[PDB]
Each structure stands twice: as structure tokens, then as C-alpha cells.
Amino acid sequence: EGDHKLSSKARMIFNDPIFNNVEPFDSDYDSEEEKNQTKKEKHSRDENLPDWFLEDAMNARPIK
Amino acid sequence: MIKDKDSAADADDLESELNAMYSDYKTRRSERDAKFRAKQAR
């Protein structure tokens, strides 16, 4: 037994290496700017009817 | 044996069935070669 404060399962589970040292100019990233850039890239890369009706290289020459 | 009738829900169900049939047909016709299955795996 050993008379530990925590149970056997609690000890084995919470002794895992992941639980190490665990006890109880300046800029912040601009999400809006990257969203706008992604939208702009999406536009520069390119309803009610059923789908069965509507549907009816930089390595090209390397040294080797 | 269900004694009920719906006006537009029947049309929606029929369209959904047709879409599912078309998707299954496309998948069956495309899976004839294992290259397509390998590509769809990733």
C-alpha cells in the first residue's frame, strides 16, 4: 500500500512525465489582416438546381 | 403503410434521394481504379 495521499490509479496516472513542474517594436498578431489577405488571395485564384442536372512546375527539369 | 401526405416535404425528400443516388453513382463509377481510392485515402 505505502500509505500515499493519492490512490494507486491517481499516482500512476499523475506521475506521467507530462506532469513535470506542475503544481496547483512590440506587436500582437493581426487576425483581421491575415483574414483580409486570405480573402484577397481566394478571389485572385478563381445554385438551386440539382447537381445531377448542372454537371450534365519548378521541378519539371532539375539537374537530374 | 403510412396514411399521411406532405406537399413540399415530399419534393424535398425526392430531391435528396436523387442527389444521394447521383453521388453514389459518381463514387461507384470513379472507384473503378485503385488510384482514385488511394487519392481519396489522403
Binding site: - | 425526392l14 430531391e15 436523387l18 443516388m21 453514389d24
Partner: peptide, 19 residues
């Protein structure tokens, strides 16, 4: 599977035109 066999071609076409 391939359940489309439950509908013959003419039934399927005449229901497709309904939509």
C-alpha cells in the same frame, strides 16, 4: 452498395423532371 436498382430508368427520369 448500389441501391439504384430499385428504380428503373424511366421512373427515375420521370421523377427527375418533377423536380
Amino acid at each position: 452498395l448500389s441501391r439504384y436498382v430499385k428504380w428503373p430508368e424511366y421512373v427515375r427520369v420521370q421523377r427527375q423532371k418533377k423536380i
